[PDB]
Design a protein around this ligand. Structure first.
Ligand SMILES: N[C@@H](CCC(=O)N[C@@H](CS)C(=O)NCC(=O)O)C(=O)O
Ligand SMILES: N[C@@H](CCC(=O)N[C@@H](CS)C(=O)NCC(=O)O)C(=O)O
Ligand SMILES: [Ca+2]
Lengths: 208, 209
């Protein structure tokens, strides 16, 4: 039903894969190698000349957040109403902003910029702890009473930052319990422990 | 008014949502934040991500310009007529956001040394929108479906500021050109665009465009 077209890395497809798995969905992975990409035809056929590319029936989508939002809308992972939907987007956009800063670090100046990035991290993670504290004491989800698509994206972002800076969640009790809680959902837990996830590099330049 | 926009005195990331509100005949309050106020630090520390725009829809307080655009798109019916169009609208907006981030990097961090390469790469960055437009009714109406969506105000602002950055950049794209003309002629939007409230605000905060 679903097909994910992407390079052999977790990157911008980790969240959407976690979402599919946790939700019991089935999908096909169409892996694109660098040689295949450098050939030029696939790229030229992509709307924005980039991956991921996603297929749902005969609907083809581009843009990782468009895919996440589409799955959130069709599978009911977008809040109970417009008010919560706006809050879900606010969380996702906040995640996207930090993922971009992370990507810039990883691909453009890991070596010289890592120390400054790590020092600024607490202040970049805190907004999510505050959001959790404002909804049911942070005991359940970040928005409302049900999981939303933005949470798979936030979970991946937290997971890759713990790799980048072990212990970065330690001073954030709500985020820490949230990560353990989400990571324990049965289907998500199996997915996170599987080779499909574990043996795929986080990024394409071997940095993390 | 049920809406309040809190931002610096620039068009920037608030131009598209303002256009949307004006084009939809909605009322809103403009709360202007000066640089001195910002440097004072307390408004900033109270902002969810330490940044503006901040938006209030009654007691619903939002941050993130695209969260605000999506919210208004959802509450005003500018988000497609079904799930498939909603996804396409999002795809347009995410593409707009990506190019806006590049424009922003150019403007604030590398104007002098980067403008040549930026402009040379610009046609390749605009083409996807021409392609999207060509695939919907021959590009004679909206970018997605048969009604206007929130992404379009964002796309229109993006195209307008790029024409200031690179005069004639749209001459290579017939559909985008006529599209801009079309949207810019909507009565309420046209009036807004020619008004002091829009015209007397700089596009960016460092004086470059
Ligand atoms: N805004 C896009 C960004 C996609 C992107 O940066 N894709 C990269 C891989 S992470 C790519 O396709 N690179 C190959 C190229 O640009 O030629 C999204 O969120 O999906
Ligand atoms: N992803 C955010 C970005 C917001 C942003 O970059 N805000 C800038 C002004 S355009 C800001 O508040 N700068 C002040 C600061 O960071 O201290 C959005 O789309 O709203
Ligand atoms: Ca409630």
């Amino acid at each position: 039903p679903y097909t994910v077209v992407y390079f052999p890395v977790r990157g911008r497809c980790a969240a959407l894969r976690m979402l599919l798995a946790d939700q019991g969905q089935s999908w096909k992975e169409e892996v694109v190698t660098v040689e295949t990409w450098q050939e030029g035809s696939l790229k030229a056929s992509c709307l924005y000349g980039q991956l991921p590319k996603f297929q749902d029936g005969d609907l083809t989508l581009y843009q990782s957040n468009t895919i996440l939002r589409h799955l959130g809308r069709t599978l009911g992972l977008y809040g109970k109403d417009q008010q919560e939907a706006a809050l879900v987007d606010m969380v996702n956009d906040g995640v996207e902003d930090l993922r971009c800063k992370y990507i810039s670090l990883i691909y453009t100046n890991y070596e010289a910029g890592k120390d400054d990035y790590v020092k600024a991290l607490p202040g970049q993670l805190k907004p999510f702890e505050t959001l959790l504290s404002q909804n049911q004491g942070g005991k359940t989800f970040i928005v409302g009473d049900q999981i939303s698509f933005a949470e798979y994206n936030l979970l991946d972002l937290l997971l890759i930052h713990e790799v980048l800076a072990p212990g970065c969640l330690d001073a954030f009790p709500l985020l820490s319990a949230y990560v353990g809680r989400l990571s324990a959902r049965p289907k998500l837990k199996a997915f996170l422990a599987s080779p499909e996830y574990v043996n795929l590099p986080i990024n394409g330049n071997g940095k993390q």
